[PDB]
Symmetry: C3
Subunit: 257 residues, 3 copies
Amino acid sequence: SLIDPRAIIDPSARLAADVQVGPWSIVGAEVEIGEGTVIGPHVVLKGPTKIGKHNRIYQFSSVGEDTPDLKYKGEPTRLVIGDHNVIREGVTIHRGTVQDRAETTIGDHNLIMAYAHIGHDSVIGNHCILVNNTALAGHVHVDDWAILSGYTLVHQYCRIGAHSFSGMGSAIGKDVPAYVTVFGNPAEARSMNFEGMRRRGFSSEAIHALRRAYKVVYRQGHTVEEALAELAESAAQFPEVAVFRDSIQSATRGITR
Amino acid sequence: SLIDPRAIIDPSARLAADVQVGPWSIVGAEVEIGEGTVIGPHVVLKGPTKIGKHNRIYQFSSVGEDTPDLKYKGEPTRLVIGDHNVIREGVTIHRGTVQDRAETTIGDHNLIMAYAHIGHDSVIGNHCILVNNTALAGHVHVDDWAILSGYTLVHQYCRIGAHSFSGMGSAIGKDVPAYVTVFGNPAEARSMNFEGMRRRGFSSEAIHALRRAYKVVYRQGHTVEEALAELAESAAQFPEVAVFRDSIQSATRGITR
Amino acid sequence: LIDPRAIIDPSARLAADVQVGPWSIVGAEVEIGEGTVIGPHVVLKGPTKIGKHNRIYQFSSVGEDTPDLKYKGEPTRLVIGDHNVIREGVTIHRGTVQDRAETTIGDHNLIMAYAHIGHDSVIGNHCILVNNTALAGHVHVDDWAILSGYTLVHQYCRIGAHSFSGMGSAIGKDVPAYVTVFGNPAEARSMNFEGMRRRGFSSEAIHALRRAYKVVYRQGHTVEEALAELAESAAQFPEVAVFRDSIQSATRGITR
């Protein structure tokens, strides 16, 4: 049987008909699970939480717990996870807080490796990779295709841009623009994720435009406001450069330099 | 029933009124648990260990294990935990060693977040916050109201002062005086935790006196002895400054600079 | 010995004397050797061979597939030797066909809580990996090495015999035998004299190693020049030859 008899399935939980649940796993009240999702053994799921289709959740994960953050006071808040995600061993994923939008959100086709932490009110897009013990403190936005190497630490409210990359052990206290590569503690900008871009099939023209955009922001002594003005032209020509420019414009904690 | 039948409760364990134990948890021999304490599912408690009242311990925590530091364990050694603490997912807390204190001690109103590690013979006071994956290597003393941010690493024997703060990813190798903020690997002193003082309702005069005290110790080229002598007058006027002065006086192995 | 609340696959193979705690899973094609104690809440997946007198603590996942995207379902293995202690929440992944299809651990190793041993890593004997040490993949750790808490090791790095990392080190290049490294990024500081004394090295060998460190690190030599300068001492002291050989095998540079 797909649902192990040693699992605890709350009567309010809603499981699509071919969901699998391993032994000694807990599917709490107000947890909804979509078709084809496999829950391993020793998993704790707490609601209100919606999990989509064809996910996989490994042992010793805690998905949908309250944040311990002292600003949370027992309010009805949610977690939403999309489709085709892989959540590895011991991952912790907390629900949102009413102070923000009362929801933690994860998109599709993400890979969240062992002992990663996804703090309250974080928003992960699609196709992201969080390597072992990556920790998102709270309110962290990770845009599509971003890769955070092992033991990357991300401060509350930070944004991590699309197709960006952090080296192992990075401690990110300011925003990481789209396509930027960062390393170290504190995290330093070291150019763009050109290898990731080439692998994903970005055009040579867009890569060239992005190389120039990086110079405008980082290498010409401009203030952020002067850089944004100087980027307007290239951003109007290349969507990739608009994604870069928009990531700089939405930065609330300054940008990683 | 408050005690789940799928839990294993040793016959020598002692459980007070309103104790709850979740499924697949182990309450070992010589574990005592005080009133109102909630043990989650998948928790391992090992003794001899005394846990006080109204605590909460989350899934996948191992509380009371022997340290792996010594290859041949001593017995008996103890772990004492006070009241109103919250110990989150996957936290490890080791008992003391026969050489040293023979006890690991945690006070009241602490918040120990996911995957934190409290090594053998450590002593935590009251109202502390250890953020995710904070690791106290052994024999570490953390005084009241200290905050250690995510993935703070503390070397053996170090003392963390009252109301101090470490930034995320700090690696602390020397004592942190009361109120002092430290960052980085290796950790360096930056300023004081003025926000914490204001939260505690310190007077503007005490805060001003603490700002001056930081300069006396860090910024005027005094030896520690001289600084202690220069602080005597302010320390006699302000109990808050006495706390600072005392933390410097007790630092026999140097202070974080 | 085998708790009735454990799940033992019919294709698993347990020696006599093996203990398995409640709510542990011993998966298909897992073999376990005599005297090995599996705690409660342990997940073992195969094909995996575990030797004798090991102890594996709760919440460990031993023998899972790597989530690394290059691993595509292939039959890969994991081999663990004897007298190892694997503490709470340790994750150990099997190998990938791209390398040698095997993750390998030797004997008498102490792998502390939440350490991670990535695919195709090779650990020798008598090593200590302190809490949350992470070996990313294809990492070789030679005998008696000590990695302090939260030491991160990049793919393909080699960690020399008797070497020591300080807490929080991020290691991106090879660490020569005996060398002590600290920081992110990791930097060489000195030698692990304590480890030499633990092995009973003679005062002459220790003096020769102190001199060898200066040849490599403190006389402005290139690696090639240093290797040439070490040849004489290495021929005289096997302990120095271990150091020299660790430098010679470092094709991607040494930690400085």
